[PDB]
RNA sequence: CAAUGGUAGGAGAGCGUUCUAAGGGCGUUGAAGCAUGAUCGUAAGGACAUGUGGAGCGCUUAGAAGUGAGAAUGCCGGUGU
RNA sequence: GCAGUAAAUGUGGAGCCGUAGCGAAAGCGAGUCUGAAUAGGGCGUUUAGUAUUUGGUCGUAGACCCGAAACCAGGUGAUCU
RNA sequence: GACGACAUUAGACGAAUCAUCUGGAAAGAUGAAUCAAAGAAGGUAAUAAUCCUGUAGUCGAAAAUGUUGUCUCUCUUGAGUGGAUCCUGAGUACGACGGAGCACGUGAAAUUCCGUCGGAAUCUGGGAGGACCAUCUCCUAAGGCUAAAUACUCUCUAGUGACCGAUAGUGAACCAGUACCGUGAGGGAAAGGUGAAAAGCACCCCGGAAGGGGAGUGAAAUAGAACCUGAAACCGUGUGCUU
């Protein structure tokens, strides 16, 4: 039948123009007293899903 | 071409790989699945995204954002896509449809500015960008927002 | 371009002009092949079906205990290795038909028709005017028109008497101008088109 | 065991726990045995206490 | 002029079995099977002759698959020690 | 869907994908987001896509075959004990 | 009830071929014809459009049915305008508690149902528009009936299949849910093929018989009833070369 989508993932990544996936960052919910001011604005950004992981999740987000 | 001498297009067809039929084929005994483990079993393999119990990527990462259930996104027509019309002519949402420059009209029409007119004509659309407005007027011609 | 119009007798009457965008293109053998394969596959009915290990009668009891007997471990008398057991992955009821883009379907009818016009197998006749169904007479028409054992006759709309006359001549099929199909034009070694059907086929296919 | 008048009868559902563990349960009507006037002759029958809230003659 | 051991494994080219479409053929002046033979190709394999056999079957091109067995203390049937 | 022979095929333009992206979003647009910034950085902008199909994989299906210890529902049985 | 109309549970008619060759027999081969609204198909001593049953086409019911045109027949009020009053579905809506249902896991949780307690309005009213309200828009609950498009095939009728050909295809082509097994629920097989025609071997010989060997039937009897073809494992009898 029609293949489904990892709804848990569709809420975490936006698809970018060259087919990349823009992801949000980790280590950013609490315990900020234990992280530096440098770590915090360099975590206030967006990175791209790495090619290693992409090869593992290509189909979980095929319809995005 | 005759029905008893036909030929398929070159390189268009290929015989598929039957598995588990003799050693000479190169996929004889284990059928290309290695020796043991889940990969070697029927209906085996592992669910995609699974990482051997390591926390999967898409739970290491946080969700963000929402969806504005009511978006106004428009079928866009570029500046250079308007030089398929003529001089002094009038462009309208439905002319952008008969000529076939816009298929679905989404929630309206929006003129953006990329190329050039080489023309002088009036228009009538739903929304405009600055550069689009400026470039309709340099050559002359109005833009009656509807 | 200009094909000779003959009478049912074979004597030249007039001349007609069929375009080269319909009866004179270069045949795409890649598109014509894919179209023939399509038609041949849409004729399959696919009513093959066997029974697996769930549909064979009975077979629910472990035939003997798992350990202790000296026999191989078995779980049902209807397993695939057993005489009388379920089939693994055989035929299932299915269809075999597919589709091609519309424009490609049109280049395949034109290619068959253009192939026919290259091999000189397109005889445009003016009309047929048969008033009663009689097979000896259609056989005559074809022999006086020197048409090969295999010919496809094309009328304008349904011509009842022309159809009832060629149903039994072995090797002749009768078709309307709209019901032209590739498998039929490509089997036929010769064609015989009514001038009205010839102008209709030029309008539709180009 | 229905109410003679309305029909209020029993119904099944779930007993759910703090951990949302489910067990099947039932809900019965407050059926009371009352002598009412049926088919002329007085007769004892089960009738709900909501049907006796207003309307029944014992 | 250089290269050619090879297992898990990747790639390519192919040989065979049944059926279908078309074309072209063979068949009581003996088909398919079966048996024998000292024959041909690089291999999967292909012919030819002679016997038994008493009716179907090849070849070319292309399509589809219940397509290839030596092992599963495999299943069924025969026959051994 | 409708017509047609359980064919081709004809018709049917709801839809779908592409021609634009960026942002959580409002929005803005060959840019946009962040930012006080006209700075820097992120992602973009140099058109090529799309329909059907052969092949390779993957998902959902028992999904390469065989094989448990076992679980649950409805029935049969105190002629042995 | 009373008249018709096609269709369906028997059926009827239905074109056109002869000769030679090989053969046990031709439908084959060869030559010369013919019909076709019929060259679908199955038979026939081999492979048949013209031999047979049929096919295309046409025709056809005493009756007993579905079906349908009508004729009856049986039923029977259609509107507007005011609007002062009146009426418009109660233990109901709805709320609380516990549950269930909504794609929606109690959640901001609408919309909706069940059990348990409460419990309303009557147009100057009531419900809905996903907590929600105010306003707007839509609707008018708590009584009832309703064909079509839709799902399925124990059957029956006609037909189709790049579906299977006897370890397959039904478990079952064959007196099969039967031998058989079990106390019982239940489980559950194996087994088609002489030839064209039975022409199924008159008599004789050995033998008690089973068998056999002649003769005869047949194209063929290593086609003789366990009967078409008859592989391999396996068992024999000879021997050329070896030990």
UniProtKB/Swiss-Prot annotation, chain A:
Positions with biased composition (Basic residues): 1-15, 37-48
GO biological process: translation
GO molecular function terms listed in the Swiss-Prot or TrEMBL record: structural constituent of ribosome
GO CC entries: cytosolic large ribosomal subunit
Keywords, alphabetical: Ribonucleoprotein, Ribosomal protein
Disulfide partners: none
Residue ranges of the TM segments: none
Region (Disordered): 1-48
Pfam families reported for this sequence: Ribosomal_L35p
Domain of life: Bacteria
Signal peptide residues on this chain, from the entry's feature table: none
Matches recorded under InterPro entries: Ribosomal_bL35, Ribosomal_bL35-like, Ribosomal_bL35_CS, Ribosomal_bL35_sf
PANTHER family: 54S RIBOSOMAL PROTEIN BL35M (PTHR33343), LARGE RIBOSOMAL SUBUNIT PROTEIN BL35M (PTHR33343:SF1)
Family as reported in the entry's similarity comment: Belongs to the bacterial ribosomal protein bL35 family.
Entry-linked NCBIfam families: rpmI_bact
Protein name: Large ribosomal subunit protein bL35
UniProtKB/Swiss-Prot annotation, chain B:
A single MF term (Gene Ontology): structural constituent of ribosome
GO cellular component: cytosolic large ribosomal subunit
Region (Disordered): 1-54
Gene3D superfamilies in the cross-refs: 3.100.10.10
Compositional bias annotation for Gly residues: 42-52
UniProt keyword terms in alphabetical order: Ribonucleoprotein, Ribosomal protein, RNA-binding, rRNA-binding
Presence of the UniProt keyword Cell inner membrane in the record: no
GO biological process, one term: translation
Comp. bias intervals (Basic and acidic residues): 1-18
Cross-referenced Pfam families: Ribosomal_L27A
PANTHER family membership: 50S RIBOSOMAL PROTEIN L15, LARGE RIBOSOMAL SUBUNIT PROTEIN UL15M
Function as written in the Swiss-Prot or TrEMBL entry: Binds to the 23S rRNA.
Family: Belongs to the universal ribosomal protein uL15 family.
Assembly mode: Part of the 50S ribosomal subunit.
HAMAP family, alphabetized: Ribosomal_uL15
Protein name in UniProt: Large ribosomal subunit protein uL15
From Swiss-Prot, chain C:
InterPro entries associated with the record: Ribosomal_uL4 (IPR002136), Ribosomal_uL4-like (IPR013005), Ribosomal_uL4_dom_sf (IPR023574)
Entry's Gene Ontology BP terms: translation
Alphabetical UniProt keywords: Ribonucleoprotein, Ribosomal protein, RNA-binding, rRNA-binding
Domain of life: Bacteria
Chain spans, region Disordered: 49-75
Annotated S-S bridges: none
Keyword Ribosomal protein set for record: yes
GO cellular component: ribonucleoprotein complex; ribosome
Pfam families: Ribosomal_L4 (PF00573)
GO MF terms, alphabetically ordered: rRNA binding; structural constituent of ribosome
Assembly with partners or alone: Part of the 50S ribosomal subunit.
HAMAP family xrefs: Ribosomal_uL4_B
Role: One of the primary rRNA binding proteins, this protein initially binds near the 5'-end of the 23S rRNA. It is important during the early stages of 50S assembly. It makes multiple contacts with different domains of the 23S rRNA in the assembled 50S subunit and ribosome.
NCBIfam families: rplD_bact
Similarity comment: Belongs to the universal ribosomal protein uL4 family.
Listed name of the protein: Large ribosomal subunit protein uL4
The species this protein was found in: Staphylococcus aureus (strain MW2)
UniProtKB/Swiss-Prot annotation, chain D:
Pfam families: Ribosomal_L28
Encoding gene, per UniProt annotation: rpmB
HAMAP family registered for this protein in UniProt: Ribosomal_bL28 (MF_00373)
Cellular-component GO terms for this entry: ribonucleoprotein complex; ribosome
Signal peptide start and end residues: none
GO MF annotation terms: structural constituent of ribosome
Similarity-based family: Belongs to the bacterial ribosomal protein bL28 family.
Record keywords: Ribonucleoprotein, Ribosomal protein
Annotated InterPro entries: Bacterial_rp_bL28, Ribosomal_bL28, Ribosomal_bL28/bL31-like_sf, Ribosomal_bL28_bact-type, Ribosomal_bL28_sf
Top-rank taxon: Bacteria
Spans annotated as Disordered: 1-20
SUPFAM superfamilies per the UniProt record, alphabetical: L28p-like
GO biological process, one term: translation
Protein name: Large ribosomal subunit protein bL28
């Amino acid at each position: 039948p029609k293949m489904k989508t990892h709804r848990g993932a569709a809420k975490r990544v936006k698809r970018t123009a060259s087919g990349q996936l823009k992801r949000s960052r980790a280590f950013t919910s609490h315990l900020f007293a234990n992280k530096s001011t440098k770590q915090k604005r360099q975590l206030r950004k967006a990175r791209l899903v790495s090619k290693s992981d992409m090869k593992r999740v290509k189909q979980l987000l095929a319809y995005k | 071409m005759k029905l008893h001498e036909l030929k398929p297009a070159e390189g268009s067809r290929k015989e598929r790989n039957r598995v588990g039929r003799g050693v000479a084929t190169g996929n004889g005994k284990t059928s290309g699945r290695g020796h043991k483990g889940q990969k070697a079993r029927s209906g085996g393999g592992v669910r995609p995204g699974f990482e051997g119990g390591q926390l999967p990527l898409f739970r290491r990462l946080p969700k963000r954002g929402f969806t504005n259930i009511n978006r106004k996104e428009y079928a866009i027509v570029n500046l250079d896509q308007l030089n398929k019309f003529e001089d002094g002519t009038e462009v309208t949402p439905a002319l952008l449809v008969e000529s076939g420059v816009v298929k679905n009209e989404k929630s309206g029409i929006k003129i953006l500015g990329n190329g050039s007119l080489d023309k002088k004509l009036t228009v009538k659309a739903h929304k405009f960008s600055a550069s689009a407005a400026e470039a309709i007027d340099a050559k002359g011609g109005a833009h009656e927002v509807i | 371009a200009n094909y000779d119009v003959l009478k049912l007798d074979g004597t030249k009457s007039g001349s007609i002009e069929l375009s080269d965008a319909v009866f004179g293109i270069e045949p795409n053998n890649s598109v014509l092949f894919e179209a023939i394969n399509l038609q041949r596959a849409s004729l399959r009915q696919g009513t093959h079906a066997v029974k697996n290990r769930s549909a064979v009668s009975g077979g629910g009891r472990k035939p003997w205990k798992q350990k202790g007997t000296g026999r191989a471990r078995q779980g049902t008398i209807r397993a695939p290795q057993w005489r009388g057991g379920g089939i693994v992955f055989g035929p299932t009821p299915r269809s075999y038909a597919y589709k091609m883009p519309k424009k490609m379907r049109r280049l395949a009818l034109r290619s068959a028709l253009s192939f026919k016009a290259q091999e000189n197998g397109l005889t445009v006749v003016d009309a047929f005017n048969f008033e009663a169904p009689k097979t000896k007479e259609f056989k005559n028409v074809l022999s006086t028109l020197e048409q090969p054992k295999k010919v496809l006759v094309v009328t304008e709309n349904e011509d009842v008497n022309v159809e009832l006359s060629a149903r039994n001549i072995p090797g002749v099929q009768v078709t309307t101008a709209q019901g032209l199909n590739v498998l039929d034009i490509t089997n036929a070694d010769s064609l015989v088109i009514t001038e009205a059907a010839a102008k209709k086929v030029e309008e539709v296919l180009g | 065991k229905q109410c003679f008048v309305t029909g209020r009868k029993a119904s099944t559902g779930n007993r759910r726990s703090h951990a949302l563990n489910s067990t099947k349960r039932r809900w019965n009507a407050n059926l009371q045995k009352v002598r009412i006037l049926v088919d002329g002759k007085p007769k004892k029958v089960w009738v709900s206490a909501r049907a006796l809230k207003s309307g029944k003659v014992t």
